[PDB]
Write a protein that binds this DNA or RNA. Structure first.
Lengths: 278, 139, 258, 94
RNA sequence: GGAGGUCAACAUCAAGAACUGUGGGCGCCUAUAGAACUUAUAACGAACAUGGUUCUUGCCUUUUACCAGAAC
RNA sequence: AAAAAAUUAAGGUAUGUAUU
């Protein structure tokens, strides 16, 4: 991190949320953080289902834990239809993680948990996201974050669970939280583009290989540009043939001199050959 | 490229598919500027003469006629789509989409085999054929 | 211009919204299509704004869609660094004591709700329920008098004029005793060899050198080479073993140091 | 290519006739956002182009009387001989 | 008038000496743009995530996955 | 009282006739 820092200047942008708010559609207020969390879970749930619905995948369903299941064992033809992209799954798993965290606060609010257990739980959640969600199946990269969290677990427990020291309690979660907060920051826009593109489609539906072919195209155009357009097409086809023949002749060491040709044309083709040869 | 003709309306596409009873109708769907839609436009043009007796070729541009984008679902620079007696033909190149063609084929020869295979299998009403060379790895 | 409104309006919208639900609200290009895409952004504000283990609850400002499409959380957490440090250390203390207190510490099962089980409404199920008190600490009243009166608020200091910038909460300054309490409380969490001298071969520069030279310190991390080729090993008069005089390891630490 | 010539449809959709089978404020805001980024954020032709201007001079009679199809390697003859040589095979004797 | 506004809009954003151009005021002073050099990249942020290209390590020679180094 | 995990996914659609 220290060795390859970045440094940005962005005069240009004023916030998504500051901009988003302006105009008729949006409104602002206050709310219980938990309540908001609950809303978010439902929103995501609905939106993913909408996507699925639009795609016609009526034999799949999401449960309230964001697990995608089959309603009927499907045929391989239907399985091919079902093959759903990684980006979608990254969103889904992301939501799953979020849901999990929210739910523990809900249960604490119910008073069924314990403030200490709660802290231990959310700590645990962050540490073990690779097991609880399995998101890594759709980005393998995220392992870096997972491994980091694991390492943090090891260090912190050595520091307070080596006195007194066996099971849970714990409840410190700052470090691991930070890791995931940064991770998300780095992925948001990828998902935004994928989703955005998807939705607009819902409403819409040198090198050797490259160079030689471009070369011809450029040359033919200009020559086809000058053609008096009483005779353009006929005049052209034989225009193509000379380039092919002159390039054959270059290969074979035959000179390629021709009877009646205007000097200007004869220049261009030689220039082309010199370029192609190189 | 100027060898092979172009189709300037979706109504030129449809009549062209119908009126050719005895031969394949091969179409490249894609747009002039593309890197990969220029390359195929070559490998076909060279082949079009050799094959004139069983296959007919045309060129179409997604931007010129966008009417056909949703029905056949066209994505990426270009798609090669084969038609015989109004019946959309279909082949498995080992690539995991049996409809149309995507990738750029490499040799002139391996391209002529595929056309020839499709025609021969097609003549018998068979809806699937197998490309002898399966470029799943390639694309 | 941009007025704030009552939360009951929002509640009304979502009460209406549930009915609209899912596929039936297919139309909405102007609200639904626009609202969702930035929805992932919305998650970031909420997680970042997690309430913290000493808070009972956090009320936050949100931007919601009139259609009931989405909720974004408005607030950004501005904290006072020494205070925040002290607060976290406080809870660290508490955790150790609590663990000492009993053997059977129950950890959560996880997947808190059943797959098919639907959402409990916050408004009825939760709003009545009560906070149930959180962590905190039994700070001595005499020692931490200045600190204790405010230590566990969402703003570590309310809106003092002398103590603080003001309402906005950028910029802060304390008295000496305030600092000393904060410092003393934060001590368990922050322990370092404060002298520059302890980090003789553990600073950034030394790491950079170890990387560049492909010679990690025993403690230190090790990278790939950076410079590829170690191929040339040419015996020669300048180099030759009869000519050289041999004592000492020439440990990698020497290489980094010099 | 007779159809290629003609140019007129009925006011007709392409899919249906053949018998075909298939195998605003938010927007404005988005546009604005994009703009806030555009604001913030060939050779071959050059080489030749200069020649192409050079061409302009040439007369229309000369454009016509241009020799048309000259082969200098006799590629066709050699290719045919090669195909004939490579045609059949034979079985090796016992 | 003043503080505060978790309200917005519009500009810029490391610092310094020295060259060139433009504008204003009475050769001098001030502002803006470009180029070069230094500081340590003392930090616009004692925080640090993702992606594209080009190279170099492993690969099924495939990915909407990656391994771990480099530069842009 | 000697010891279980740290790896993921696409390249897997039978034609063909008949009915809707």
């Amino acid at each position: 991190n220290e060795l390859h820092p970045t440094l940005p200047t962005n005069h240009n942008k004023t916030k998504l949320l500051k901009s988003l708010k302006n105009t008729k559609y949006f409104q602002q207020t206050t709310i219980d953080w938990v309540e908001a969390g609950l809303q978010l879970c439902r929103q995501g749930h609905n939106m993913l289902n909408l996507l699925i619905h639009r795609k016609g995948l009526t034999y799949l369903h999401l449960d309230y834990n964001f697990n995608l299941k089959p309603t009927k064992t499907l045929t391989t033809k239907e399985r091919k239809k079902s093959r759903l992209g990684n980006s979608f799954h990254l969103m889904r798993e992301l939501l799953k993680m979020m849901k999990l965290i929210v739910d523990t606060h809900v249960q604490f609010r119910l008073g069924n948990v314990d403030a200490f257990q709660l802290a231990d739980g959310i700590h645990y959640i962050l540490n073990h996201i690779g097991q609880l969600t399995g998101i890594y199946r759709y980005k393998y990269k995220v392992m870096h974050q997972i491994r980091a969290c694991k390492d943090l677990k090891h260090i912190i427990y050595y520091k307070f669970n080596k006195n007194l020291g066996k099971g849970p309690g714990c409840g410190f979660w700052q470090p691991a939280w930070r890791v995931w907060l940064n991770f998300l920051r780095g992925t948001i826009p990828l998902l935004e583009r994928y989703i955005g593109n998807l939705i607009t489609r819902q409403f819409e539906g040198r090198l050797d290989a490259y160079y030689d072919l471009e070369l011809r195209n450029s040359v033919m155009d200009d020559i086809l540009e000058m053609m008096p357009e009483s005779i353009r097409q006929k005049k052209a086809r034989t225009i193509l043939q000379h380039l092919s023949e002159a390039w054959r002749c270059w290969k074979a060491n035959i000179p390629w001199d021709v009877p009646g040709m205007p000097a200007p044309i004869k220049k261009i083709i030689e220039r082309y050959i010199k370029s192609k040869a190189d | 490229s100027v060898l092979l003709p172009q189709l300037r309306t979706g109504w030129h596409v449809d009549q062209a598919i119908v009126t050719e009873t005895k031969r394949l109708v091969v179409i490249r769907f894609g747009r002039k500027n593309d890197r990969q839609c220029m390359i195929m436009d070559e490998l076909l043009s060279s082949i079009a003469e050799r094959v004139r007796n069983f296959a007919v070729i045309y060129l179409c541009d997604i931007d010129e006629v966008s009417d056909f984008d949703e029905m056949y679902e066209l994505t990426d620079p270009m798609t090669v789509m084969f038609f015989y007696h109004n019946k959309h033909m279909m082949c498995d190149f080992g690539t995991g989409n049996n409809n149309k063609l995507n990738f750029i084929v490499d040799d002139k020869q391996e391209m002529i085999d595929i056309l020839e295979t499709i025609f021969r299998g097609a003549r018998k009403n068979k809806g699937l054929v197998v490309s002898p060379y399966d470029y799943n790895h390639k694309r | 211009p941009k007025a704030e409104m009552p939360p009951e309006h929002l509640r009304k919208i979502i009460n209406t919204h549930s009915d609209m639900a899912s596929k039936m609200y297919n139309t909405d290009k102007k609200a639904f299509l626009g609202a969702l895409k930035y929805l992932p952004h919305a998650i970031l504000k909420l997680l970042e704004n997690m309430p913290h283990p000493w808070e009972q609850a956090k009320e936050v400002k949100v931007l919601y869609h009139t259609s009931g499409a989405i909720t974004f959380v408005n607030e950004t957490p501005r904290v006072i660094e020494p205070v925040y440090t002290a607060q976290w250390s406080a809870t660290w203390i508490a955790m150790r004591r609590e663990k000492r207190d009993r053997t059977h510490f129950k950890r959560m099962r996880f997947p808190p709700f059943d797959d098919d089980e639907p959402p409990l409404s916050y408004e009825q199920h939760i709003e009545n329920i009560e906070p149930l008190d959180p962590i905190n600490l039994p700070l001595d009243s005499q020692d931490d008098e200045y600190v204790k009166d405010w230590l566990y608020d969402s703003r570590p200091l309310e809106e003092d004029s002398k103590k603080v910038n003001g309402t906005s909460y950028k910029k802060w300054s304390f008295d000496l005793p305030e600092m000393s309490n904060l410092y003393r409380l934060s001590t368990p969490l922050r322990d370092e060899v404060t002298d520059k001298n302890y980090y003789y071969l553990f600073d950034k520069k030394s790491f950079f050198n170890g990387k560049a030279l492909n010679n990690a310190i025993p403690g230190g991390p090790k990278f790939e080479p950076l410079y590829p080729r170690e191929e040339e090993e040419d015996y020669n008069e300048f180099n030759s073993i009869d000519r050289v005089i041999f004592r000492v390891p020439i440990r990698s630490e020497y290489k980094v140091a010099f | 290519p007779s159809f290629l010539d003609q140019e007129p449809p009925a006011g007709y959709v392409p899919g249906i006739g053949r018998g075909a089978t298939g195998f605003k404020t938010l927007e404005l805001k988005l546009a604005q956002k994009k703009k806030k980024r555009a604001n913030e954020k060939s050779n071959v032709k050059r080489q030749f182009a200069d020649l192409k201007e050079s061409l302009a001079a040439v007369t229309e009679s000369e454009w016509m009387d241009i020799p048309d199809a000259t082969d200098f390697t006799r590629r066709n003859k050699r290719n045919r001989i090669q195909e004939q040589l490579n045609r059949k095979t034979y079985a090796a004797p016992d």
